[PDB]
Amino acid sequence: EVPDNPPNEIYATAQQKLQDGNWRQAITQLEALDNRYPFGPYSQQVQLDLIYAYYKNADLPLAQAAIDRFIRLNPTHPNIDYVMYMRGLTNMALDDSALQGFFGVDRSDRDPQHARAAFSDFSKLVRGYPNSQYTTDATKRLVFLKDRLAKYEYSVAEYYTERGAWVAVVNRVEGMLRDYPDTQATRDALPLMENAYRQMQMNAQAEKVAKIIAANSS
């Protein structure tokens, strides 16, 4: 797909095949301008344009690889915030996404193992670039990137209330407490540790958790 030119014509194909929407064409030119010439001046912009080719082609592992090809090779661009935008968003869709969500089929009970990354890479956005043009989009994702990480811990907190592992309830809930300070499922985790304690004959500790619910009613 790449004509062997100087990389600028290969960039001239690349930026036009970006505007084509043919990322399949655009990735090949965005790479092979830099493959035979690893001295492209827009290579940091290529590493922006590659994710812009990758994410709009849904190439989230390659978009994460272009982040590494941005960060290791040329992070001189202060679009690291864009890269921290294009990392916390890239690990977001790569964690748990399907076409089943037209009427509400579950995807938060699943493993948020890459939504764990999508929180932190957006957390690197809102910390390493707190005033940046992308912190606001991160903040909207980051709340689901805590709460789906909360509701999965709630999904572990719920079964030990069912199984009878009441120690493991308290280990699940107070971890969900100390991690997630505002998620409602943490208030839903809250009476389980109490009802764990009543099964574990710590009803004094449970009534303290019932006092927590009394002030986490607010």
Binding site: Q45, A93, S97, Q133, T135, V143, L177, Y180, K211
Partner: protein, 59 residues
């Protein structure tokens, strides 16, 4: 390829992370307190700008 009936938009897909706003904060009463902000999931929500989710610009 495309549908021979030339019809799209029959599904909306998953976009739920795009809109999540911080829920009702937990207020631990004194003597019953637990430090709820130990992990990074007490989000460093900061002053930055732009639209929400993925609809914001991608260079």
């Amino acid at each position: 390829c495309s549908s021979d009936s030339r019809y799209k938009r029959q599904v909306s897909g998953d976009e739920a992370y795009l809109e999540a706003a911080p829920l009702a904060e937990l207020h631990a009463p004194a003597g019953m307190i637990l430090p709820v902000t130990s992990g990074d999931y007490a989000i460093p929500v900061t002053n930055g700008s732009g639209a929400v989710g993925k609809a914001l610009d991608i260079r």
